[PDB]
Design goal:
Chain B: This is ATP synthase F(1) complex subunit alpha, mitochondrial. The structure is cut from a larger assembly and holds two copies of chain A and one copy of chain B. Helix content of chain A is 34%, strand content 20%. By secondary structure, chain A is an alpha/beta fold. Chain A has three domains: 73 residues, Thrombin, subunit H (Beta Barrel), CATH 2.40.10.170; 276 residues, Rossmann fold; 117 residues, Orthogonal Bundle (Bovine Mitochondrial F1-ATPase, ATP Synthase Beta Chain, Chain D, domain3), CATH 1.10.1140.10. Chain B folds into three domains: 70 residues, Elongation Factor Tu (Ef-tu), domain 3 (Beta Barrel); 286 residues, Rossmann fold (3-Layer(aba) Sandwich), CATH 3.40.50; 131 residues, Lysin (Up-down Bundle). In chain B, strand 3 and strand 4 form a beta hairpin. By secondary structure, chain B is an alpha/beta fold. In chain B, strands 8-12-11-13-14-10-15-16 form an eight-stranded mixed beta sheet, with helices on both faces. Chain B has a six-stranded antiparallel β-barrel with strand order 1-2-5-4-3-6. The chains are: A alpha/beta, B alpha/beta. The interface between A and B is large, with 55 and 56 residues. Strand 4 of chain A pairs antiparallel with strand 1 of chain B. Bound molecules: aurovertin B (AUR), phosphoaminophosphonic acid-adenylate ester (ANP) (2 copies), adenosine-5'-diphosphate (ADP) and magnesium ion (MG) (3 copies). One magnesium ion (MG) binds next to helix 2 of chain B.
């Protein structure tokens, strides 16, 4: 079917049709252009017109221009032939390696797996990161989220995790770069090449890459998540595959949504956001999940605007994760890396019946002491430690060393820490933390604990200081 | 003369977007009536305008296009109701989602019915035992009462509700029908996998048998999530109106409000304070009023509600938070501070209340915890006022010594709801000063020991306290004996 | 006249009359309903269409439905035959005891008493409540207001006042529940009866009741206060008696309005309130008043959204009162009931020329020290207590003690406090404080001062506490 461009504003193009009005979600192809310009139908304004969202810049379009109903929604190449390739929101390759030749094509809009399809197995996923493992452990086929204001560590953490987990993973992986830096995509691709996860020679790549960065018009950014998502869904269901899905940054999607929302003509909700915020997050977040058919462990980076966690975007996201790593500027500025907030990060697995009570008890042990420190903090602030009780000063000591032991060098951040990256095994973390708690190290200096792997290394660092 | 599509009982979509259809005929629809779309998709007639009907859609509006035929139903929205639902998981409209077959319903009920008036009810007098000391002792909940669970993310709000539902096996597995309590759990805006987890645990606890779970999750259309609470409510009134007893958890009313806000704004209704419709208070009042205690004239049945609300930065003063706190018969405020501190449940004594008071408590309980609440309040204060041991007397040294001991006793784990008599025993021990010399750190361990002792050896005292429902003179004397002695052996 | 419904959107219904447009305030009845639906005309949109507020549910209404102009604002059965009964916004009995056979009927809408109708007598109305009496005495025929955020004691306080005052009161009483809890009207009704304030067998009924609870549509809520108030004005004027008016909670009248305001097409004023708040409040509050004909003693409970006394509503109401009891969650949070704020509660009669200087000097004395202590609280908090002068550490003492002596076990809250309710006489109050202020108890412990009635119980309790 052929409609005509009626109006154009940013990414919101209104197209009128005479004989066949395309259903909502259908992808239209604008005619008369050097490159593909897909329009996704958003609503029927009545009067035989449809209001759509462009998937690329709209410059050049002209009223009266011809548009064609694709007859379906954005459909993209799915299968193993996407492995090792970089693709667009609309599924075209952007790696200058030819067409992605697949048997099947999938549409980016699907419904979420049903209740009966859900899974409830809960297995811990050890990452080698002390704070995470101890206090807010991730879980196989689970939902993890890294909350972070600007330049706090979200991406570095994803990388480190990709390194520590993705690297030695059996199944496939899907990275989806949403609204982030182009150079990052580039940084990754080439790195992926090097360590061979991407092989440009054979069919041995384990990762499929989807990108719609900081340079795309809103509509694209608003859909790429869906795109990466789809690719992942394929491996899950069609091959009962155990997937890994990394997204940077899912905040961008919502942001993108707010960009076109006014254009769609909606009264804004709080903070200028689109009134459909939650539902949009919803029908999207709900497809990123493990099922009876397959497993999807997904790590998603969540940008926090102005550092405000009460912002509708992040706020609304907590409810979709199984484990959350809230990064803090305050901590990072203190020099603690990863800048994880220990009293603010949580995990549905932090249950004695799952991590064992030994784990459970150190975990809550640690938090309790930090909480305690916390109350003392008002006073230490005006009057310092002097006026403190002998007992109080002891929590403080311990807390300052527990606080220091929570930091750790990542390989990925070697260039900045000036130290060699470390991976600590769970039992090593459970342990090192007991001892600290248990006063086994009240003699060592704080500094000894800073920036180390296992406790054993902390003892040594103490000798070196002394 | 094909006369099937006259504009009085039918209409045609003028436009559709974002789940709002602006239907063209529907000349005889009634405000709030249900209509049907060609696609078998049901909607609801909310705006009746001069030239169009604004229809809210109970599903994916993707299947609707300009021109579609819309049909009246002649019915104001309603849903399946009754005993058939127990043990089943339904959506906001009633349909099963546990793929365990159709519901065998013979009864229906409008989701939107005014709460019974003044005349039809009687003062809340029968307890609704949570199983949680803290709650059952300090902020008692009676049947027909509405008590709010409020706190930031992850402070443990749902757990309070789960433990409660689970604690109800006691009576339900029992003989007495008056003591039985059917439970309803409404998940709103929540995540499918979380709910699926939830229903598992309920099943693993053998609680599903008496529970119905209405689910209106994250990807469910706004209107589903919106309706969900009223839906579940209606299923509860069944029991309420038939001399049976029901308990309904609205988990949580925060996400429903956003759905309401969305639904509402998309209908072009001017946004109000904080972007919500000017009537969000009403949105909740209307609902929670329905939880009620009917007099014997009406079956003496009841509906008890436990709505959940999520604060941000533990700010209870917040507009919504306060909107709901001013409707319910109290609130349970959970703080993450307390939580981390070890105080689990993170109930904040001072800030949580019960507007029913002891009338919802057994004499046994009233006996032990009658003044405890204000005592602890007063404790927390001086505890602060002496974070510097300022020239402190005795009455206050005693005050802090009790305070701490009592605080330890109110602590409690998950999934192990205690029986009323059990609670009385343990509180007893504290309140009476028998523990004033034990080391705080000891307390928890003691309670496990003690409770062990009486349950195993002394179930005669337990059964009497339980039975008489009071603490007689001799029971109070057999108790003294046990605690003091055991305590000693224990303090060897 | 007969109009048709042309649009339905929530509580607001637009009606089109072919001939003769019903004036503003007129009540219209919707034809074809199992229950009586009244629509109050709110505006003349033009084109012979009026915009109205529904006095009840709008479900089931249909475009084109018939509507008759009643030819008059909502009129209710007013008179002595209202006593002991329960009424609707629209004057219908809701107690299931049959019609209300009044000789006359009254429109809920009416002009407020003129300026030359005002009275200026001011005589203390002792309540038995230590705090109020001591520091913010209520006045017979005056306007009293109980301010408090959610769950701080507004209702309970209104409850104990009914007990301590309504109960002996020789004259009528009208309690209007506006937008509050239904459970509550049932508690109260049944209490009026078990205490004979309400008599179901005879005409000894001394209290009429009117209700428009939280389970109602904005429309009803916007009017019950009027109904209530209207019943009360009768007994004031047409009978000339001493009325006692209780409204719980007047805030609800205002929130009711805000709830339909947008549908009426208005730009919001600040805090979301409708732009006519004050005037809306004014034309109402101005009726609630004592005149030369009769005397009203209104006790209105006032909700404070988010605990913010500055909220346009609570804020706008202060000027309508002669006496104010301000309650605070911060106080309640400590276990001090009634949670009145001693430094934020005021009475127009707190005048030496009116209560006397012993009264006065005490009150003021009590307030100075509490203020003096407030100022220090935050400071010794951090800097501790040592550096404080004995002079200054005695006021910390006496203050903390007073803070307690101000609490009191109410007779309506035993279910809450686990203590027998005490009522204290004015002099027992003045004296007790006088003494504390005098240094005459610097030996007893604070705790001895918590939740007790008369000063003697504080002394007795010291001993009991003495182990
Ligand atoms: C406001 C930051 C808070 O976040 C923490 C989690 C603590 O809050 C509580 C509840 O625990 C906190 C008060 O202080 C931080 C402590 C930071 C410590 C920084 C240490 C740095 C440091 O420590 C050393 O020992 C040697 C070092 O350099 C060689 C360096 C840079 C922790 O991350
Ligand atoms: N784990 C770490 N250890 C040491 N330094 C780190 C670490 N993580 C982040 N940094 C420092 O912080 C900078 C920002 O890291 P990065 O992972 O990019 O933050 P981000 O959350 O991705 N920023 P953006 O995405 O712009 O909000 C890094 O380049 C390092 O300088
Ligand atoms: N009494 C308890 N003792 C120990 N752990 C508890 C207690 N009750 C709750 N939990 C745990 O504390 C965490 C919070 O539980 P939960 O009730 O889900 O809080 P919540 O308010 O529902 N969180 P969310 O709804 O995700 O914002 C979970 O790990 C529970 O297992
Ligand atoms: N006078 C009082 N003495 C003791 N506790 C009280 C008193 N008034 C209030 N409380 C506590 O406050 C709760 C709320 O009081 P209530 O009148 O409902 O609040 P509101 O002011 O919100 O109407 C009561 O259920 C009770 O537990
Ligand atoms: Mg980044
Ligand atoms: Mg929850
Ligand atoms: Mg009240």
């Amino acid at each position: 079917t052929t409609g005509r461009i009626v109006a154009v504003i940013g990414a919101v193009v209104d197209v009128q049709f005479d004989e066949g009005l395309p259903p909502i979600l259908n992808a239209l192809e604008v005619q008369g252009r050097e490159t593909r310009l897909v329009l996704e139908v958003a609503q029927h304004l009545g009067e035989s017109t449809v209001r759509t969202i462009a998937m690329d810049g709209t410059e050049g379009l002209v009223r009266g221009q011809k548009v064609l109903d694709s007859g379906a929604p954005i459909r993209i190449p799915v299968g193993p032939e996407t492995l090792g390739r970089i693709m667009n929101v609309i599924g075209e390759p952007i790696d200058e390696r030819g067409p992605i030749k697949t048997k099947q094509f999938a549409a980016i809009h699907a419904e979420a797996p049903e209740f009966v399809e859900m899974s409830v197995e809960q297995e811990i996923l050890v990452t080698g990161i002390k704070v995470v493992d101890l206090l807010a452990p991730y879980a196989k086929g689970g939902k993890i989220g890294l909350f972070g204001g600007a330049g706090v560590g979200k991406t570095v953490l994803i990388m480190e995790l990709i390194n520590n987990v993705a690297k030695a993973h059996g199944g496939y992986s899907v990275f989806a770069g949403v609204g982030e830096r182009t150079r990052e995509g580039n940084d990754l691709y080439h790195e992926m090449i090097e360590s061979g996860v991407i092989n440009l020679k054979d069919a041995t790549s384990k990762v499929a890459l989807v990108y719609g960065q900081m340079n795309e018009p809103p509509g694209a950014r608003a859909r790429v998540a869906l795109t990466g998502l789809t690719v992942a869904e394929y491996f899950r269901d069609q091959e009962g595959q155990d997937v890994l899905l990394f997204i940077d940054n899912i905040f961008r999607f919502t942001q993108a949504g707010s960009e076109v929302s006014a254009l769609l003509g909606r009264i804004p909700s709080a903070v200028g956001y689109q009134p459909t915020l939650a539902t949009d997050m919803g029908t999207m977040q709900e497809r990123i999940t493990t099922t009876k058919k397959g497993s999807i462990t997904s790590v998603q980076a969540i940008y926090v605007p102005a550092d405000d966690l009460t912002d509708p975007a992040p706020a609304t996201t907590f409810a979709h994760l199984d484990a959350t790593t809230v990064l803090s500027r305050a901590i990072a500025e203190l020099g603690i890396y990863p800048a994880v907030d220990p009293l603010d990060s949580t995990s549905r697995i932090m249950d004695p019946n799952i991590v064992g009570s030994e784990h459970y008890d150190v975990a809550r042990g640690v938090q309790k002491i930090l909480q305690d420190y916390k109350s003392l903090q008002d006073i230490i602030a005006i009057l310092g430690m002097d006026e403190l009780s002998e007992e109080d000063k002891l929590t403080v000591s311990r807390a300052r060393k527990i606080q220091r032991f929570l930091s750790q060098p990542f390989q990925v951040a070697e260039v900045f820490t000036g130290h060699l990256g470390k991976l600590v095994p769970l039992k090593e973390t459970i342990k090192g933390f007991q001892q600290i708690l248990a006063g086994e190290y009240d003699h060592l200096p704080e500094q000894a604990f800073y920036m180390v792997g296992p406790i054993e290394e902390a003892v040594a660092k103490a000798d070196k200081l002394a | 003369a094909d006369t099937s599509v006259d504009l009085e009982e039918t209409g045609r979509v003028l436009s559709i977007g974002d789940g709002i259809a602006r239907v063209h005929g529907l000349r005889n629809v009634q405000a709030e009536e249900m209509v049907e779309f060609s696609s078998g998709l049901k909607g609801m007639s909310l705006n009746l305008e001069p030239d169009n009907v604004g229809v809210v859609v109970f599903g994916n509006d993707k299947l609707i296009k300009e021109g579609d035929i819309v049909k009246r139903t002649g019915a104001i929205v309603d849903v399946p109701v009754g005993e058939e639902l127990l043990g089943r998981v339904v959506d906001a409209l009633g349909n099963a989602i546990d793929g365990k077959g159709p519901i065998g319903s013979k009864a229906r009920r409008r989701v939107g019915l005014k709460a019974p008036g003044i005349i039809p009810r009687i003062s809340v007098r029968e307890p609704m035992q949570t199983g949680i000391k803290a709650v059952d002792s300090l902020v008692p909940i009676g049947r027909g009462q509405r008590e709010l669970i409020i706190g930031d993310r992850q402070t443990g709000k749902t757990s309070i509700a789960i433990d409660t539902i689970i604690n109800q096996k006691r009576f339900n597995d029992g003989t007495d029908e008056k003591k039985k309590l059917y439970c309803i759990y409404v998940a709103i805006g929540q995540k499918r996998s979380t709910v699926a987890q939830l229903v598992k645990r309920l099943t693993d606890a053998d609680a599903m048998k008496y529970t119905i779970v209405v689910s209106a999750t994250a990807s469910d259309a706004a209107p589903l999530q919106y309706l969900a609470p009223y839906s579940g409510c209606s299923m509860g009134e069944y029991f309420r109106d038939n001399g049976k007893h029901a308990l309904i958890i609205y988990d949580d009313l925060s996400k429903q409000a956003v759905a309401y806000r969305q639904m509402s704004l998309l209908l072009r209704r001017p946004p109000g304070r904080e972007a919500y419709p000017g009537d969000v208070f009403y949105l909740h009042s209307r609902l929670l009023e329905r939880a009620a205690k009917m007099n014997d004239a009406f079956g003496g049945g009841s509906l008890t509600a436990l709505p959940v609300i999520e604060t941000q930065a533990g700010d209870v003063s917040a507009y919504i938070p306060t909107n709901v706190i001013s409707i319910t018969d109290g609130q349970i405020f959970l703080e993450t501070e307390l939580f981390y501190k070890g105080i689990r449940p993170a109930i904040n004594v001072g800030l949580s209340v019960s507007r029913v008071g002891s009338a919802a408590q057994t004499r046994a309980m009233k006996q032990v915890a009658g003044t405890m609440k204000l005592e602890l309040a007063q404790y927390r204060e001086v505890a602060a006022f002496a974070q510097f041991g300022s020239d402190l007397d005795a009455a206050t040294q005693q005050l802090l010594s009790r305070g701490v001991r009592l605080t330890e006793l109110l602590k409690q784990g998950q999934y192990s709801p205690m029986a009323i008599e059990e609670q009385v025993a343990v509180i007893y021990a504290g309140v009476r000063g028998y523990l004033d010399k034990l080391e705080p750190s000891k307390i928890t361990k003691f309670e496990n020991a003690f409770l062990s002792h009486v349950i195993s050896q002394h179930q005669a005292l337990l059964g009497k306290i339980r039975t008489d429902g009071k603490i007689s003179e001799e029971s109070d004397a057999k108790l003294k004996e046990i605690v003091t002695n055991f305590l000693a052996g224990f303090e060897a």
